Design a protein around this ligand. Structure first.
Ligand SMILES: O=C(O)[C@@H](CO)OP(=O)(O)O
Ligand SMILES: [Li+]
Ligand SMILES: [Mg+2]
Ligand SMILES: [Mg+2]
Lengths: 436, 436
């Protein structure tokens, strides 16, 4: 039934080129757009780029697109595979590549064929994308779990210009009773946060980073958190709102040491914190603010710091760069007892099937799953359907600003409204939304 | 036939609530998302907001949403209107309302039904939306015309904190041979510019405002002009990319005159200018810089100074607030010989048919039409189709950053590819793409 597969270059939300995949069947054209990260883990599957310095400063994707059109397509189409059989779909792409890392076709050629096939299959079956995804991953669907949105309000690190080391600062409305309410609450806080920011930091401070958070030239985490809690308080939602962090530590890991005083190609062989040192600081913030989740408190391969901290934290601990949505890296973390939550990113692994298995291996181990965008997003809303399909009860898809973020949030409002009484907001149970 | 009309509240690119309409026919479900400006003209059709300071700070659209659902919907459906008949659909909507400014139901309640029916009409005819918009318009279609994108790169005035009072600085890759090459050019300059800006003004200077352009504290118009032309040269595109300006003059129109330092605040009176005065700075800049378009050079009623200037400007002169997409203010302008191009903002008028007559009246008078976005945009790509539909040869939909701006531009890529040989890139002939 798949009668053609085709790629083209489109733009991500930064302006860089990205791959879009269109798959045609008797029921129509299904389109998928691949995201792109800034803060990418060493162990991510390969994103292929042209490297032609004239064009796009070397960032074009014309090779990945060619791979789609010249390599996968002809062969995908001749295998006449059932799109409803996601496994067989992916097994097929995976062996065309024939590498551990998708370094021969590029994760960015494969994913879009993966993802567009799930769309084409939902269509054959006359069901909503999230219903099919539930099928595939074998999730419970009575009721369906509406996720708590982890909205990135204050952007730091690699996501924005200025001093701030911690990359993301999030607010989580776990006290809302519905998704429409959690979004209403979250945007109210955000408009207050913005207003406070310009009052205190000047107009400029008010502009946004890549994920739609404001980016003041703040030096410490405490300053950032104080501001945010003034904003929650100001919006009148004290108590209904919690905090989550993404330290993106890996980006500032140097020897068994951690550099907070940076993005600053000279200051100081002594801001530099050791792991216990850093654990310690986390435990400070923790006693002071309503933090309920910390993601990547330690670098990608500093296994020992993770375990050490994990013993005392008593809050959700998300693995992003540590695990890169890879079942093999996930097994080690479960074993080293490093984390308790997986940051799910379909483009870190490269296929839907490998991304579902990662989620099933985490849930199996007693872990949460937070589906996340990439910092370089698109108009594509796949992940909105995926988080509901997977029953995770938690998503990270940006600030309530910039439509590559609101496109997912707007998709969640419609799904909510659709499921009516057969849905539940994760709320304070976000950590284990699968087990609701 | 239309079986249901339904509306809901979704969010815009700023995180403010807006209206989404869904129109059901035998062909499927057609939706619209209405944008929302920040700028405005006093004479604009009225957007209905709730004014509930307890929700969204008074910015809810629940009332507009209820107008659709409870007032329009029943009646629209009972009327059994031919959706291919746009005038009929809109005549209907205008009568339902009964006020000259759509203030009974609200231009946001109306626009949604209006745009959604054009999508449902296109489907029944089995043509892409642009082709049906061609139909409605009475536009030439051999070839079709792809527009020159006016890309916002840098903001001043109220968008930013130095002393600069002029509002948007845009680049226009006129020199390009296709849309695809013009967007590539456009985004290489954008990136260069963000580099320059962080080197010359600091890392925080790279954070973006509402429409994706940077906003560094600049002192003078020249300072801004020079940074732009350096960026053009750094990129290697010298000679192919022009400059467009949005003055948003009203902003510093201190009754008597034009307060440059409106941002003052110790407001240097008497040193406030009069048309003929401002007109000379304009002229001065035009001689030093490759400006090709100037928007809202004088305030929305200061008709006096528009004519005055128009006499010898010799470049495209765009009417935004002065006209507000109203066939009443266009006539005056045309009659006054104030400007030669209309910025077209559908939600300024409230219906698709009124937007088309307005563009039709401009073209009649020999003016150009720059279809345009609003600051509060959505993932909807309606204006992509509309610009190719009307054959205007120029659009303004923001920087190549943030996907409520790239959605439109990505959508013109797909279009250009779909027309193949049936299309042409406006290039240098942008002021008159209709007569191409
Ligand atoms: O670090 C991260 O979790 C992500 C998402 O906010 O950023 P990036 O896509 O750039 O890795
Ligand atoms: Li990351
Ligand atoms: Mg992360
Ligand atoms: Mg304007």
């Amino acid at each position: 039934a798949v009668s053609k597969v085709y790629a083209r270059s489109v733009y991500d939300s930064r302006g860089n080129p990205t791959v879009e995949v269109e798959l045609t069947t008797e029921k129509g054209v299904f389109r998928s757009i691949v995201p792109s990260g800034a803060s990418t883990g060493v162990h991510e599957a390969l994103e292929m780029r042209d490297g032609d310095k004239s064009k796009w400063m070397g960032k074009g994707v014309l090779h990945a697109v060619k791979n789609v059109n010249d390599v996968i397509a002809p062969a995908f189409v001749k295998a006449n595979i059932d799109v409803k059989d996601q496994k067989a779909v992916d097994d097929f792409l995976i062996s065309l590549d024939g590498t551990a890392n998708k370094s021969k076709l590029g994760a960015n050629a494969i994913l879009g064929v993966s993802l567009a096939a799930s769309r084409a299959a939902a269509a054959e079956k006359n069901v909503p994308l999230y219903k099919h995804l539930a099928d595939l991953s074998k999730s419970k669907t009575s009721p369906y779990v509406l996720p708590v949105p982890f909205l990135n309000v204050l952007n730091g690190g690699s996501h924005a210009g200025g001093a701030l080391a911690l990359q993301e600062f999030m607010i989580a409305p776990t006290g809302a009773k519905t998704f429409a309410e959690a979004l209403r609450i979250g945007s109210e806080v955000y408009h207050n946060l913005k207003s406070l920011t310009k009052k205190r930091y000047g107009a400029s401070a008010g502009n946004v980073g890549d994920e739609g958070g404001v980016a003041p030239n703040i030096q410490t985490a405490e300053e950032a958190l104080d501001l945010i809690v003034d904003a929650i308080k100001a919006a009148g939602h004290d108590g209904k709102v919690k905090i989550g962090l993404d330290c993106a530590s890996s980006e500032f890991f140097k020897d068994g040491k951690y550099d907070l005083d940076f993005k600053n190609p000279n200051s100081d062989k002594s801001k530099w914190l050791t792991g216990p040192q850093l654990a310690d600081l986390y435990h400070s913030l923790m006693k002071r603010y309503p933090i309920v989740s910390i993601e990547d408190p330690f670098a990608e391969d500093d296994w020992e710091a993770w375990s050490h901290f994990f013993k005392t934290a008593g809050i959700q601990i998300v693995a992003d760069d540590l695990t890169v949505t890879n079942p093999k890296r996930i097994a080690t973390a479960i074993e080293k007892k490093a984390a308790d939550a997986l940051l799910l990113k379909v483009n870190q692994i490269g296929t839907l099937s490998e991304s579902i298995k990662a989620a099933q291996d985490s849930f199996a181990a007693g872990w949460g799953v937070m589906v996340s965008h990439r910092s370089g997003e698109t108009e594509d809303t796949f992940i909105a359907d995926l988080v509901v399909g997977l029953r995770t009860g938690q998503i990270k898809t940006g600030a309530p600003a910039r439509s590559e973020r609101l496109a997912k949030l707007n998709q969640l409002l419609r799904i909510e409204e659709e499921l009516g009484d057969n849905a539940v907001f994760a709320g304070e149970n976000f950590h284990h939304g699968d087990k609701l």
